[PDB]
C-alpha cells in the first residue's frame, strides 16, 4: 500500500538538473468562439 502523493526535494545547495524549475503553459484555442486578445499595436507621432 502507498499514499498517492510525495513532496519534491529542492534545496539552495543543489546543482543544475536537481534545482527547481518553474513551468508555465499558455494553453489557448483559436477560431471557434469570439476573440478577446492580441499582442500590441504600436503607433507614431501625429503627422499633418
Amino acid at each position: 500500500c502507498y499514499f498517492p502523493l510525495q513532496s519534491y526535494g529542492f534545496q539552495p545547495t543543489y546543482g543544475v538538473g536537481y534545482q527547481p524549475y518553474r513551468v508555465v503553459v499558455l494553453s489557448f484555442e483559436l477560431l471557434h468562439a469570439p476573440a478577446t486578445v492580441c499582442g500590441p499595436k504600436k503607433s507614431t507621432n501625429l503627422v499633418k
Binding site: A33, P34, A35, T36
Partner: protein, 47 residues
Amino acid sequence: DGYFKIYSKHTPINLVRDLPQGFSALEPLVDLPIGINITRFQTLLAL
C-alpha cells in the same frame, strides 16, 4: 459574430398609455464579447 451589441436612448415624456409617435435613432451604448447563440430572453424588474 459572437459579439453582443447594445444600443440605447433616454428621453423624458408626458405620455399616459402608448408609445411616442415621431422618430429618433438609438446610439450604440456598449459592445460585449459574449459568444452565445441566443434563442430566448427575460427582463428583471423591482419588487
